[PDB]
Amino acid sequence: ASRLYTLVLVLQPQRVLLGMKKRGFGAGRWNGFGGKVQEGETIEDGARRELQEESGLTVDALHKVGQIVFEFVGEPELMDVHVFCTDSIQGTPVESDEMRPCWFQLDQIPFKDMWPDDSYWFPLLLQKKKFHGYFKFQGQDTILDYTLREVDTV
Amino acid sequence: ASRLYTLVLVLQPQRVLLGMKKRGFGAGRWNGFGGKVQEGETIEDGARRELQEESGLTVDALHKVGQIVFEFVGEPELMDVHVFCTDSIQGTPVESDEMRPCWFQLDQIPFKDMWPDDSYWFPLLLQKKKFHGYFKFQGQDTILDYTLREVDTV
Ligand SMILES: C[C@H](Oc1cc(-c2cnn(C3CCNCC3)c2)cnc1N)c1c(Cl)ccc(F)c1Cl
Ligand SMILES: C[C@H](Oc1cc(-c2cnn(C3CCNCC3)c2)cnc1N)c1c(Cl)ccc(F)c1Cl
Numbered sequence A, B: 001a002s003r004l005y006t007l008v009l010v011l012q013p014q015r016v017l018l019g020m021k022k023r024g025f026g027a028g029r030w031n032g033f034g035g036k037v038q039e040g041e042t043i044e045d046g047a048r049r050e051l052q053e054e055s056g057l058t059v060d061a062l063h064k065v066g067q068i069v070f071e072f073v074g075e076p077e078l079m080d081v082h083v084f085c086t087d088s089i090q091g092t093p094v095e096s097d098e099m100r101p102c103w104f105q106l107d108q109i110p111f112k113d114m115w116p117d118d119s120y121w122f123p124l125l126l127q128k129k130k131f132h133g134y135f136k137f138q139g140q141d142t143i144l145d146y147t148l149r150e151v152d153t154v
């Protein structure tokens, strides 16, 4: 009962790219780039595709950095989120009707306007750690319970 | 907002001692031996004392093997349980009005008539692993959420 999603962080030595969702769901928050994985498509290919669609950037190799499972109380489907990082990109970030990308210096990451789980796992990503997490949500703003640990193998 | 408790498992190569609580709280289940720690008493001394009180056995050195925190929904105080093991004891187990001790072969540990958290951490103890756990209970029979991991240092 899990649906695959990807999440991509463009993390460079002094800054990280995030996107402000402008409409529909998740509007108002900063987040990484990603989406659903297609039938017959690899998870990594889906991650590369969604990075382009949402940010305008072209990535070659993506690196696996985490897996997070989200449970939403009252919803049957779990989200199985495969998290990736890259430092090398081509192109410059594109603002669209859906998404407004911006670079953040690492000390200015806007945690108060990001999903609450990011406060837990993003700091691991910044120190080049890999992780497995599980977050149980009630609505969009409340973590009821979670687990998180560093791993050697994603 | 945590209260200290001890829990002692007499674990020998082929068998483990458990006690059937005969009355009051916990009646009807098999469990290890322990209780509250006194003012001015070390946690280990409290563990040794309670092993004698509840089982009739004298232990010298106890070995630290785990820490488990219990939360009961609707109750303010958490239980901070310090878990110990020993293989060497003196005396023979004593049945009292409060407790009926019995030896169990390791393949016959009565998990269905033990507290539900034991199904998670007891197998770690059997393989000489050390652990930190947290269990959130609703009533006596339902684990709502938990975390458990092996540790090098209790
Ligand atoms: C990028 C975003 O990240 C998060 C979303 C959420 C989240 C919270 N609520 N939702 C709802 C749950 C009800 N179904 C629609 C998404 C999604 C929590 N933490 C995140 N890091 C996201 C979204 Cl919108 C949708 C699927 C995802 F896998 C992710 Cl990572
Ligand atoms: C030996 C027993 O072990 C467990 C008790 C419980 C438990 C479940 N409910 N309770 C109630 C909670 C309400 N306050 C009285 C104890 C205790 C769960 N798992 C255990 N392994 C126990 C008891 Cl009765 C009391 C305090 C403890 F620290 C332990 Cl380990």
Ligand SMILES: [Cl-]
Pocket: A007, A030, A031, A032, A115, A118
């Ligand atoms: Cl995100």
Ligand SMILES: [Cl-]
Pocket: B007, B030, B031, B032, B115, B118
């Ligand atoms: Cl027990």
